[PDB]
Design a protein around this ligand. Structure first.
Ligand SMILES: *[C@H](CC(=O)OCC)[C@H](C[C@@H]1CCNC1=O)NC(=O)[C@H](CC#C)n1cccc(NC(=O)c2cc(C)on2)c1=O
Ligand SMILES: *[C@H](CC(=O)OCC)[C@H](C[C@@H]1CCNC1=O)NC(=O)[C@H](CC#C)n1cccc(NC(=O)c2cc(C)on2)c1=O
Lengths: 302, 302
């Protein structure tokens, strides 16, 4: 019945994306009740990037210094504070399109949809995963900062990402909605590097479980193996190692397909060794690891 | 700055997705002003699939025979007609969340976002392209029919797709919002086949133009070639042939990168002949053809 990388619907978040300008510099922010969250680097000038004192740069501002527009209509600011790497700006008006929501801090290999925005307007939406090295392989132009990542859960919106910046390799770094960065990164134009990235092993498996449910069984083999043998191979190929928790978590997809997590791992193990022979799994010629167990069922079961 | 497959934001459409039940059978429909469009096969029973008389099956129904719920609140039906392969159901109430909109009939290789829905609720959103053989490689479970495809253009929503059914290969068929199918397909459980599929040549190019703007130039070469030589190779590899219109259309990305459409085609030509040597373009190990010229700029320029 098909397997696509698919995002959550964006409407609920769309109604929360306001424009924040401070002096000249203009980026997106998130409007939940009478707060507007945006990156603190909104207060920076082109120079205040190599080495900026935020606490200081900010002590040189007031509520009226910041301009917040919903589509075209300004919100009057009445409070402005620093929340780690964000600004928490109080506003005269509380958002009428504010959904049920929570702020969460996703673990690496966990996924979220990004809503890419410019001057407060949403430009598009795509799925991605939080890398082990604590990065994102997003698509983000200049003015994209403030753009958010989120998981929906019925009518509840869980915010997990706000975009701050791009790193050397061409990869993206940002923070939770508590303004606390992901990985060891800082809001400055210094030379910072993402660590070496591993492959999210659990996700790769879930993706085979999905290939199977989608009638794609070629790479299946008879061989089994122990978590122990498999972990030795995983290290070679820079795969994140498998914890029994992970195998328990694949239980539902395991039972659902009548393939034992460890039988599947044996199939993977082989693929890591025996290439793919220019075949395709679900149409991919590489091992997709941006799909959680949860992603897989949700799509393949309701 | 990154290149992702990204959908348009779904909010505008989200507010248009109602549940339509007729007897037992329950699928999604689209609520624009006081009309509800849904597939006509809503009126079918499990048996009325191999060979159903719709005009007849429908002549055996009235306005109250159909149940339309917005989230949970019923819309009173006051008119029910057949619009080719859709139903046009009139309702007591006009939709308060109806956007500016038009109904268009995209050409093959043109793309749209799909909003996958179940019992009137949106489940997720993904980009795809209308294949040359007039199919879609979507992800669609049972109850997904009624789900729509669309292009946004500032605040205007252009509807181009409604989902009717799956075909042998694992591919998806449906219609425009005039109820007129795409390709030679019919709303019946007969054996219908998609033609052989070609590769959307223009899109493959735009995707290299994007790889280039995203600092990915390895596959570039010195060789040029004429539209004529390139078309001969295209046929071999089941690529859709290049019309000068197509090359004119790549003009903006051409100028934008200082690579001449025909210089780029020469690079492609080579790739079709000289594999990829297990390299990646924009991280893909195959030639991506689900990206229009227009898709490419929009993402890489605002
Ligand atoms: C924020 C955009 C925004 O809205 O703010 C301006 C109004 C951007 C997002 C970037 C632009 C390109 N791609 C992105 O993801 N972030 C920045 O530009 C940050 C600002 C902060 C903090 N920033 C500032 C200065 C330099 C850099 N870049 C690098 O450090 C860097 C080094 C290498 C190599 O590649 N990038 C940066 O992200
Ligand atoms: C519509 C789902 C819906 O909401 O209607 C039921 C309430 C589905 C969408 C399908 C389900 C699985 N994947 C999809 O994209 N469409 C149908 O099930 C249609 C109905 C019509 C018209 N339909 C009916 C009967 C058979 C088939 N399938 C095939 O013809 C077929 C043959 C092979 C091989 O694979 N599929 C069908 O789509």
């Amino acid at each position: 019945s098909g397997f696509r990388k698919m995002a959550f619907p964006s409407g609920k978040v769309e109604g929360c994306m306001v424009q924040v300008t401070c002096g000249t510099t203009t980026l997106n922010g998130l409007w939940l009740d009478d707060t507007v969250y945006c990156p603190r680097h909104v207060i920076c000038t082109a120079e205040d990037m190599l080495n900026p004192n935020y606490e200081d740069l900010l002590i040189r501002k007031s509520n009226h210094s910041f301009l917040v527009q919903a589509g075209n209509v300004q919100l009057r600011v009445i409070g402005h504070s620093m929340q780690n790497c964000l600004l928490r700006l109080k506003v005269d008006t509380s958002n009428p399109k504010t959904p049920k929501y929570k702020f969460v801090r996703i673990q690496p290999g966990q996924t979220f949809s990004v809503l890419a925005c410019y001057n407060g307007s949403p430009s598009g939406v795509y799925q991605c995963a939080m890398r082990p090295n604590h990065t994102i392989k997003g698509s983000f132009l200049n003015g994209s900062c403030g753009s958010v990542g989120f998981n929906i859960d019925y009518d509840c919106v869980s915010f997990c990402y706000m975009h701050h910046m791009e790193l050397p390799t061409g990869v993206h770094a940002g923070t939770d909605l508590e303004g606390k960065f992901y990985g060891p990164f800082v809001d400055r134009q210094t030379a910072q590097a993402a660590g070496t990235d591993t492959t999210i092993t659990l996700n790769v498996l879930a993706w085979l479980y999905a290939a199977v449910i989608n009638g794609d069984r070629w790479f299946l083999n008879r061989f089994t193996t122990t978590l122990n043998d498999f972990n030795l191979v995983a290290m070679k190929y820079n795969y994140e190692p498998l914890t029994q928790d992970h195998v328990d978590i694949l239980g539902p997809l395991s039972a659902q397909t009548g393939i034992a997590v460890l039988d599947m791992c044996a199939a993977l193990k082989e693929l890591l060794q025996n290439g793919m022979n220019g075949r395709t799994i679900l149409g991919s010629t590489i091992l997709e690891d941006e799909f959680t167990p949860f992603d897989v069922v949700r799509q393949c079961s309701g």
